[PDB]
Design an enzyme around this catalytic site. Structure first.
Site, PDB file in Angstrom:
ATOM      1  N   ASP A 194       0.815  -1.210   0.000  1.00 36.63           N
ATOM      2  CA  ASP A 194       0.000   0.000   0.000  1.00 36.63           C
ATOM      3  C   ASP A 194       0.851   1.265   0.000  1.00 36.63           C
ATOM      4  O   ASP A 194       1.905   1.321   0.635  1.00 36.63           O
ATOM      5  CB  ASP A 194      -0.939   0.017   1.209  1.00 36.63           C
ATOM      6  CG  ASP A 194      -1.859  -1.186   1.249  1.00 36.63           C
ATOM      7  OD1 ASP A 194      -1.489  -2.233   0.682  1.00 36.63           O
ATOM      8  OD2 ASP A 194      -2.950  -1.086   1.852  1.00 36.63           O
ATOM      9  N   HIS A 251      -1.156   4.573  -0.428  1.00 34.81           N
ATOM     10  CA  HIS A 251      -2.174   5.443   0.159  1.00 34.81           C
ATOM     11  C   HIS A 251      -1.807   6.920   0.127  1.00 34.81           C
ATOM     12  O   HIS A 251      -1.808   7.580   1.161  1.00 34.81           O
ATOM     13  CB  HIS A 251      -2.460   5.030   1.605  1.00 34.81           C
ATOM     14  CG  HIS A 251      -3.361   3.843   1.728  1.00 34.81           C
ATOM     15  ND1 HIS A 251      -4.686   3.872   1.348  1.00 34.81           N
ATOM     16  CD2 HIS A 251      -3.133   2.593   2.196  1.00 34.81           C
ATOM     17  CE1 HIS A 251      -5.233   2.692   1.571  1.00 34.81           C
ATOM     18  NE2 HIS A 251      -4.311   1.897   2.087  1.00 34.81           N
ATOM     19  N   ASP A 287      -4.147  -0.098  -3.502  1.00 35.24           N
ATOM     20  CA  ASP A 287      -4.311   0.940  -2.480  1.00 35.24           C
ATOM     21  C   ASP A 287      -3.305   2.069  -2.669  1.00 35.24           C
ATOM     22  O   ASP A 287      -2.430   2.289  -1.830  1.00 35.24           O
ATOM     23  CB  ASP A 287      -4.192   0.347  -1.071  1.00 35.24           C
ATOM     24  CG  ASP A 287      -5.470  -0.335  -0.618  1.00 35.24           C
ATOM     25  OD1 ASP A 287      -6.389  -0.477  -1.453  1.00 35.24           O
ATOM     26  OD2 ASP A 287      -5.555  -0.743   0.563  1.00 35.24           O
ATOM     27  N   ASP A 310      -6.285   7.529  -1.178  1.00 31.80           N
ATOM     28  CA  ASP A 310      -6.963   7.670   0.116  1.00 31.80           C
ATOM     29  C   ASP A 310      -6.007   7.849   1.295  1.00 31.80           C
ATOM     30  O   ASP A 310      -4.875   7.364   1.280  1.00 31.80           O
ATOM     31  CB  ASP A 310      -7.882   6.473   0.384  1.00 31.80           C
ATOM     32  CG  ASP A 310      -9.121   6.489  -0.485  1.00 31.80           C
ATOM     33  OD1 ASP A 310      -9.484   7.576  -0.983  1.00 31.80           O
ATOM     34  OD2 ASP A 310      -9.738   5.418  -0.666  1.00 31.80           O
ATOM     35  N   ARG A 311      -6.490   8.578   2.303  1.00 33.05           N
ATOM     36  CA  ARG A 311      -5.801   8.803   3.577  1.00 33.05           C
ATOM     37  C   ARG A 311      -4.528   9.645   3.469  1.00 33.05           C
ATOM     38  O   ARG A 311      -4.227  10.426   4.369  1.00 33.05           O
ATOM     39  CB  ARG A 311      -5.494   7.463   4.249  1.00 33.05           C
ATOM     40  CG  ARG A 311      -6.732   6.814   4.840  1.00 33.05           C
ATOM     41  CD  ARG A 311      -6.551   5.327   5.036  1.00 33.05           C
ATOM     42  NE  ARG A 311      -7.806   4.673   5.395  1.00 33.05           N
ATOM     43  CZ  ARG A 311      -8.005   3.360   5.342  1.00 33.05           C
ATOM     44  NH1 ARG A 311      -7.030   2.556   4.939  1.00 33.05           N
ATOM     45  NH2 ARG A 311      -9.181   2.850   5.685  1.00 33.05           N
ATOM     46  N   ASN A 329      -8.626  -2.536  -2.730  1.00 30.16           N
ATOM     47  CA  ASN A 329     -10.010  -2.274  -2.356  1.00 30.16           C
ATOM     48  C   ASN A 329     -10.315  -0.780  -2.292  1.00 30.16           C
ATOM     49  O   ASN A 329     -11.475  -0.380  -2.180  1.00 30.16           O
ATOM     50  CB  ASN A 329     -10.339  -2.938  -1.015  1.00 30.16           C
ATOM     51  CG  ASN A 329      -9.449  -2.455   0.113  1.00 30.16           C
ATOM     52  OD1 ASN A 329      -8.224  -2.417  -0.014  1.00 30.16           O
ATOM     53  ND2 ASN A 329     -10.064  -2.083   1.230  1.00 30.16           N
ATOM     54  N   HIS A 330      -9.272   0.041  -2.364  1.00 26.49           N
ATOM     55  CA  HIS A 330      -9.439   1.489  -2.353  1.00 26.49           C
ATOM     56  C   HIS A 330      -9.498   2.052  -3.766  1.00 26.49           C
ATOM     57  O   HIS A 330      -9.821   3.224  -3.962  1.00 26.49           O
ATOM     58  CB  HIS A 330      -8.312   2.155  -1.563  1.00 26.49           C
ATOM     59  CG  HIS A 330      -8.574   2.224  -0.091  1.00 26.49           C
ATOM     60  ND1 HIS A 330      -9.148   3.323   0.510  1.00 26.49           N
ATOM     61  CD2 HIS A 330      -8.357   1.325   0.896  1.00 26.49           C
ATOM     62  CE1 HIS A 330      -9.266   3.102   1.806  1.00 26.49           C
ATOM     63  NE2 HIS A 330      -8.794   1.896   2.068  1.00 26.49           N
ATOM     64  N   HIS A 383      -4.189  -8.159  -3.775  1.00 27.31           N
ATOM     65  CA  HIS A 383      -4.215  -7.170  -2.702  1.00 27.31           C
ATOM     66  C   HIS A 383      -4.640  -7.763  -1.361  1.00 27.31           C
ATOM     67  O   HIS A 383      -3.901  -7.690  -0.380  1.00 27.31           O
ATOM     68  CB  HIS A 383      -5.148  -6.011  -3.052  1.00 27.31           C
ATOM     69  CG  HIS A 383      -5.194  -4.949  -2.000  1.00 27.31           C
ATOM     70  ND1 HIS A 383      -4.121  -4.131  -1.726  1.00 27.31           N
ATOM     71  CD2 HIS A 383      -6.173  -4.590  -1.135  1.00 27.31           C
ATOM     72  CE1 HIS A 383      -4.439  -3.305  -0.745  1.00 27.31           C
ATOM     73  NE2 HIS A 383      -5.679  -3.562  -0.370  1.00 27.31           N
ATOM     74  N   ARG A 390     -13.434  -6.392   9.296  1.00 24.75           N
ATOM     75  CA  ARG A 390     -13.740  -5.249   8.445  1.00 24.75           C
ATOM     76  C   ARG A 390     -15.233  -5.121   8.157  1.00 24.75           C
ATOM     77  O   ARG A 390     -15.712  -4.043   7.808  1.00 24.75           O
ATOM     78  CB  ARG A 390     -12.966  -5.354   7.128  1.00 24.75           C
ATOM     79  CG  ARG A 390     -11.458  -5.407   7.299  1.00 24.75           C
ATOM     80  CD  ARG A 390     -10.759  -5.580   5.959  1.00 24.75           C
ATOM     81  NE  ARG A 390      -9.310  -5.680   6.106  1.00 24.75           N
ATOM     82  CZ  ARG A 390      -8.480  -4.642   6.063  1.00 24.75           C
ATOM     83  NH1 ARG A 390      -8.954  -3.419   5.875  1.00 24.75           N
ATOM     84  NH2 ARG A 390      -7.175  -4.829   6.204  1.00 24.75           N
ATOM     85  N   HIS A 393      -2.711  -5.103   1.913  1.00 26.15           N
ATOM     86  CA  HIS A 393      -3.996  -4.843   2.561  1.00 26.15           C
ATOM     87  C   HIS A 393      -3.932  -4.582   4.073  1.00 26.15           C
ATOM     88  O   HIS A 393      -4.841  -3.968   4.629  1.00 26.15           O
ATOM     89  CB  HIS A 393      -4.950  -6.009   2.286  1.00 26.15           C
ATOM     90  CG  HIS A 393      -6.387  -5.698   2.568  1.00 26.15           C
ATOM     91  ND1 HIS A 393      -6.952  -4.474   2.288  1.00 26.15           N
ATOM     92  CD2 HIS A 393      -7.376  -6.460   3.092  1.00 26.15           C
ATOM     93  CE1 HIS A 393      -8.228  -4.492   2.636  1.00 26.15           C
ATOM     94  NE2 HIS A 393      -8.509  -5.685   3.124  1.00 26.15           N
TER      95      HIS A 393
HETATM   96 MN   LIG Z   1      -6.522  -2.519   1.330  1.00 27.02          MN
HETATM   97 MN   LIG Z   2      -4.794  -0.194   2.504  1.00 28.19          MN
END
Ligand SMILES: [Mn+2]
Ligand SMILES: [Mn+2]
Lengths: 22, 293
Positions: B59, B61, B87, B90-91, B119-120, B168, B216, B243
């Protein structure tokens, strides 16, 4: 040199890892 | 059209600068990156067949300057072949710079640079966790929908030299054949259940025999015996996923049958974790490079 295959060996892990500080 | 070298140049221009320095590409330059890379994604298999040597990363991110450090320590393309496990947004504070550079390299070296779907890389997720906000702030809503159309064409998994399986999230109770993955058509959204969902959401778990409910609230968790049975059935040695944030950037599971990679050190600025990067050579010997925060 491409590494994408068109549509015997085994996996090992090196005992030494490199560590970068930042 | 699309001056790739100019775009890449302006993206690499901010090395060594005060961390936080943005790169404001034009709406058209970014839109061009999405559309061209979209072609290359669809042109290539949804289940990538790769060869050694290559570097695998977890990741990112939106932690753009940490991405540049990976390339700096690992070697800027095409000095090294790369595989990212998803990923990318995001964030982080600079998701735009992150994904743009990745796509730019994907177009520049489509045979030596590969990106998996996390998944992002889904509209339902990155609308909330920061990517859409970044698009709305620095550009417009329509640019975000363009990214969405591009993310829906990302490959889902990859196999390196018939021995290393990459995705992922992890495994799926519905994953019996590798053809079950190849049969998936793109563009596609990420469902809230099923093969495609689990491949991007599932997690390994120590205290689980078989399959269990996932913390999750999405997909499942799987145990060590599942990994063992899976590897034996498809003649595989290693499962390489991401992940999940891990303390040392890399973390083994089920006696080194599975490895978790995470390449974003100081995740969200709330963690003290390191970022790792796995190098795989022609002899399939895997070595780890760590990024301390
Ligand atoms: Mn993820
Ligand atoms: Mn992630």
């Amino acid at each position: 040199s491409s590494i994408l295959k068109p549509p015997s060996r085994r996996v090992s892990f090196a005992d030494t890892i490199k560590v970068f500080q930042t | 059209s699309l001056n790739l070298d100019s775009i890449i140049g302006r993206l690499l221009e901010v090395q060594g600068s005060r961390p936080g320095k943005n790169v404001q590409l034009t709406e058209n330059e970014i839109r061009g990156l999405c559309l061209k890379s979209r072609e290359i994604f669809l042109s290539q298999p949804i289940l990538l067949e790769l060869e050694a040597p290559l570097k695998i990363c977890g990741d990112i991110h939106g932690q753009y300057y940490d991405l540049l450090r990976l390339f700096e320590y690992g070697g800027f393309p095409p000095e090294s072949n790369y595989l990212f496990l998803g990923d990318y947004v995001d964030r982080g504070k600079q998701s735009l710079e992150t994904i743009c550079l990745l796509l730019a390299y994907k177009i520049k070296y489509p045979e030596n640079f590969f990106l998996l779907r996390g998944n992002h890389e889904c509209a339902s997720i990155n609308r909330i966790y920061g990517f859409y906000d970044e698009c709305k702030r620095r550009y417009n809503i329509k640019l975000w929908k363009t990214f969405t159309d591009c993310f829906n064409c990302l490959p889902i998994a990859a196999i390196v030299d018939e021995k290393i399986f990459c995705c992922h999230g992890g495994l799926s109770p519905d994953l019996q054949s590798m053809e079950q993955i190849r049969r998936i058509m793109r563009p596609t959204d990420v469902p809230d259940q099923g093969l495609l969902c689990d491949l991007l959401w599932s997690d390994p778990d120590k205290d689980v025999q078989g399959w269990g409910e996932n913390d999750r609230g999405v997909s499942f968790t799987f145990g060590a015996e599942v990994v063992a049975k899976f590897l034996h059935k498809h003649d595989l040695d290693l499962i390489c996923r991401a992940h999940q944030v891990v303390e040392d950037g890399y973390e083994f599971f089920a006696k080194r049958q599975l490895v978790t990679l995470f390449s974003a050190p100081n995740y969200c600025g709330e963690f003290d974790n390191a970022g790792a990067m796995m190098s795989v050579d022609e002899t399939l010997m895997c070595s780890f490079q760590i990024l301390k925060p």
